[PDB]
């Protein structure tokens, strides 16, 4: 009858930049999705390998909640097998993911008149992330032919870039908070069950 703390995942006082995404581990608790189904704030609620009309009836070995901010047009990339700057360089789901992806518009909290420019994403990287890999390094990226020696220049870029979150952007350029719940089902007693 330990209720799982979805309140502190979905309504956390701070959300991470997608390049430095946060993971919270959920276990030893009862997960009621009623607050989640009854959101009418969520614009995305997609599950993979499981039905969302079954969740309160299911138990899992472990559950992880990954969370971060991206722009609206990029929510499509938070799904298995996707490509693009977020799926390739920031947050990668395994080809065989089991879990759910929940997202909602956070313009009111994460935008500022004149712009909030402190949510960042990785814009360059030499190779794709591995699934669930997290890369917070900040080494200068060689985009041209001449090596950079750690100096920024016209072809030598800091690898992160800022989103420009201002409330007048169209929704595809507005901030969305994302929570990814991965359900891992192992050959063991369940620690996360519905009611």
């Amino acid at each position, epitope marked *: 009858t330990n209720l799982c703390p979805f309140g502190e995942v979905f309504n956390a006082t701070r959300f991470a930049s997608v390049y430095a995404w946060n993971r919270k581990r959920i276990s030893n608790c009862v997960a009621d999705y009623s607050v989640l189904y009854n959101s009418a704030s969520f614009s995305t609620f997609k599950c993979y390998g499981v039905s969302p009309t079954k969740l309160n009836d299911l138990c899992f070995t472990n559950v992880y909640a990954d969370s971060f901010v991206i722009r609206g047009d990029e929510v499509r990339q938070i799904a298995p097998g996707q490509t693009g700057k977020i799926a390739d360089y920031n947050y990668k789901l395994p080809d065989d993911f089991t879990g759910c992806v929940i997202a909602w518009n956070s313009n009111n909290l994460d935008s500022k008149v004149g712009g909030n420019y402190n949510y960042l994403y990785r814009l360059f990287r030499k190779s794709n992330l591995k699934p669930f890999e997290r890369d917070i390094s900040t080494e200068i990226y060689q985009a041209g032919s001449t090596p950079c020696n750690g100096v*920024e220049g*016209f072809n030598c870029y800091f690898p992160l*870039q800022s989103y420009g979150f201002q409330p007048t952007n169209g929704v595809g350029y507005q901030p969305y908070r994302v929570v990814v719940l991965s359900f891992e089902l192992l050959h063991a007693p369940a620690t996360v069950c519905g009611p």
Partner: nanobody, 118 residues
């Protein structure tokens, strides 16, 4: 949106200060840059100013003559150009430094014309 301004007709040897004011995805908190396009050539980087970690950098043809600066509070980038040369004649654009290699950056402004009389 973005407004660049300050361009004009100047004698050789003269000066110009360009101003850029950008908001949203035309601004970057990591690095902002001035670029230029001479007629019939391709865009060229002129100067970039990282918000930290690193000093501003300049095209070889303008080092010692141009100075890039910022005001983070007003979302402004500035290019002070001294000792101007006829071949500095071009349209000058302001954008995030990474814009030339960002396949998603489609927010290039109309620019401001600088013309240097010979």
């Amino acid at each position: 949106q973005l407004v660049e301004s300050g361009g004009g007709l100047v004698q050789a040897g003269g000066s110009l200060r360009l101003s850029c004011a950008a908001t949203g995805y035309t601004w970057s908190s990591v690095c902002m840059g001035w670029f230029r396009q001479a007629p019939g050539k391709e865009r060229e980087g002129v100067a970039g100013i990282p918000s930290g970690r690193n000093r501003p950098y300049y095209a070889d043809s303008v080092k010692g003559r141009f100075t890039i600066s910022q005001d983070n509070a007003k979302n402004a980038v500035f290019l002070l150009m001294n000792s101007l040369k006829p071949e500095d004649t071009a349209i000058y654009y302001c954008a995030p430094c990474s814009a030339p290699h960002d396949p998603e950056y489609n927010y290039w402004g109309q620019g401001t014309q600088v013309t240097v009389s010979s």
